[PDB]
Amino acid sequence: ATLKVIGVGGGGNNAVNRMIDHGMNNVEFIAINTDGQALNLSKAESKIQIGEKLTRGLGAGANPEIGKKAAEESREQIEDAIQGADMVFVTSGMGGGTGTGAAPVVAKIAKEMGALTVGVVTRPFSFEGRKRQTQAAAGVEAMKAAVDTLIVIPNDRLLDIVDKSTPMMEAFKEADNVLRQGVQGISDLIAVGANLDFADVKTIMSNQGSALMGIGVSSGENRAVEAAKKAISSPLLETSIVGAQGVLMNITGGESLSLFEAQEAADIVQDAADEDVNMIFGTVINPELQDEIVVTVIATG
Ligand SMILES: Nc1nc2c(ncn2[C@@H]2O[C@H](COP(=O)(O)OP(=O)(O)OP(=O)(O)O)[C@@H](O)[C@H]2O)c(=O)[nH]1
Ligand SMILES: [Mg+2]
Numbered sequence: 001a002t003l004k005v006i007g008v009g010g011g012g013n014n015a016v017n018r019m020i021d022h023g024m025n026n027v028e029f030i031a032i033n034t035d036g037q038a039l040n041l042s043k044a045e046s047k048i049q050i051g052e053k054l055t056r057g058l059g060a061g062a063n064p065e066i067g068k069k070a071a072e073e074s075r076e077q078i079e080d081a082i083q084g085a086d087m088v089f090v091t092s093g094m095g096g097g098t099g100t101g102a103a104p105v106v107a108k109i110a111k112e113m114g115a116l117t118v119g120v121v122t123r124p125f126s127f128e129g130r131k132r133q134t135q136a137a138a139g140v141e142a143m144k145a146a147v148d149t150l151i152v153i154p155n156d157r158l159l160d161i162v163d164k165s166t167p168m169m170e171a172f173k174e175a176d177n178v179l180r181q182g183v184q185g186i187s188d189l190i191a192v193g194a195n196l197d198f199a200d201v202k203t204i205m206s207n208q209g210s211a212l213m214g215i216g217v218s219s220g221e222n223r224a225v226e227a228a229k230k231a232i233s234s235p236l237l238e239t240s241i242v243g244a245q246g247v248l249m250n251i252t253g254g255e256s257l258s259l260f261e262a263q264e265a266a267d268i269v270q271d272a273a274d275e276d277v278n279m280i281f282g283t284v285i286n287p288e289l290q291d292e293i294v295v296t297v298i299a300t301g
Contacts, residue, residue: 001086001087001190001198002028002084002085002086002087003026003027003028003085003086003087003088003089003183003186003187004027004028004029004030004081004082004085004087004088004089004115005019005024005027005028005029005030005088005089005091005179005183006029006030006031006032006081006082006088006089006090006091006106006110007029007030007031007032007044007091007092008032008033008090008091008092008098008099008102008103008106009032009033009034009060009067009092009093009096009097009098009099009100009102009103010033010035010038010059010093010096010098010099011092011093011096011099011122012031012032012033012090012091012092012093012099012103013031013033013038013039013041013042013044014172015091015175015176015179016029016030016031016042016043016044016091017041017042017043017044018169018172018173018176019176019179019180020043020044021043022173022176024180024183026187027183027187028045028046028085029043029044029045029046030044030045030046030047030048030081030082031044031046031047031048032047032048032049032050032071032078032102032106033048033049033050033059033098034049034050034051034054034055034057034058034059034060034066034067034070034097034098034102035055035057035058035059035098036049036057036058037057038059046081048074048077048078048081050070050071050073050074050077050078050102051066051067051069051070051071051073051074053073054066054069054070054073055070059096059097059098060096060097060098060101061097062095062096062097062132062135063097063101064096064097064100064101064135064138064139065097065101066097066098066101067096067097067098067099067100067101067102067103068101068102068104068105069101070098070101070102071101071102071105071106072105075109078105078106078109079109079113082109082110082113082115083113085110085113085115086115086116086198087115087116087117087118087186087198087201088107088110088115088116088117088118089118089119089120089179089182089183090103090106090107090110090117090118090119090120090143090147091119091120091121091179092119092121092122092139092143093121093122093124094121094122094123094124094135094136094137094139094140094143095123095124095128095132095133095135095136095139096135099121099139100135100136100138100139100142101139103119103121103139103142103143104139104142104143104145104146105146107119107143107146107147108145108146111146111147111148116148116201116202116205116206117146117147117148117149118147118148118149118150118151118182118205118211119143119144119146119147119149119150119151120150120151120153120178120179120182121139121140121143121150121151121152121153122152122153122154122155122175123136123137123140123152123153123154123155123156123238124136124155125155125156125158125159126156140152144209148205148206148207148208149205149208149209149210149211149300150209150210150211151178151182151210151211151212151213151237151239152210152237152238152239153175153178153236153237153238154236154238155175157235157236157237158171158172158174158175158236160235161174161235161236174236175236178234178236178237181213181214181215182211182213184215185213185214185215185296185297185298186201186213186298188250188252188296189201189248189250189282189296189298193284194250194252194282194283194284195282195283195284196248196250196280196282200248200280201248201298203246203278203280204246204247204248204278204280204298204300205246205248205298205300208245208246208300208301209300209301210239210300210301211239211298211299211300212232212234212237212239212240212241212244212297212298212299212300213297213298213299214230214231214232214233214234214296214297214298215230215231215294215295215296215297216228216229216230216231216232216294216295216297217230217292217293217294217295218230218292218293218295219291219292219293220291223261223291223292223293224251224261224262224264224265224293224295225264225265225268227251227265227293227294227295228264228265228266228268228269228295228297229268230295231295231296231297232268232269232272232297232299240272241269241272241273241297241299242272243272243273243274243301244272244273244274244277244299244300244301245273245274245276245277245278245300245301246277246278246279246299246300246301247269247270247273247277247278247279247280247281247297247298247299247300248280248282248297248298248299249265249266249269249279249280249281249282249295249296249297249298250281250282250283250284250295250296251265251266251281251282251283251284251293251294251295251296252283252284252285252286252289252293252294252295252296253283253284253285253286253289253292253293253294254285254286254287254288254289254290254291254292255285255287256291257283257285257293261293262283265293265295266279266281269297269299273299274301
């Protein structure tokens, strides 16, 4: 199962850059932008400049019409970069011209090509003003129409987890962890073996609206509950787990992994989930983990 991560627009490229720098592997990174200079600064293995004839290598100047038109004209390049992917993550900051306009097009192409398509986008800080926000909301609507599952990160949530002195790059790295947990969560679920596979992923995620993808790690007596609570919690997400209609859940531990622990973790997630939840639950024994427990949760709907 091949995973690709596609960053669209300035924010998208920045996320790709920060994540490649902090060493993601066995994932293909693709950078797409109208802005030629941005692309030159990209560490991404595969780069696509869109809308050359529109912008002459400039950005979209906050015009979403441009980003959309640029993406549509480069359909052939975009398809070619995508082909072979089983699952695609399109990441982008909403509110500008390139991301807002081109990211839904990129996402729609991937979904039409048959890839399981996940969007991870940001809404701008309130201080960026009412017009940026409104424009971003249009982006979010378009993304939601184009993806299998969408994950929205309001940039304002970053303000809630920093103090007066927290460096901006650290804050942005926190936001990157949202996409990171999603990507390694899948990669592990598909890795041999959890008695779970990509077919399970597709059942839980295909056409499911919104998604949460989390990983919790813990130890000690309350380890199972603690790991699970970590996995289903993030203050950066617009979407809580309550009412989920689909859950893919895996618990990994050493030989000490008890049946009661698995039940405890599963009950944590099950309480939050809707009565008619489609839950696919897996367990993996990995002696390497010693006293550690790892809980992975993908929730949708
Ligand atoms: N979390 C996070 N958000 C970002 C980052 N960079 C930009 N954003 C957000 O994304 C929104 C869009 O900014 P850009 O991605 O730079 O704009 P663009 O998509 O390239 O569009 P144009 O520059 O007009 O062509 C901004 O309003 C910010 O709120 C980033 O590095 N991290
Ligand atoms: Mg730009």
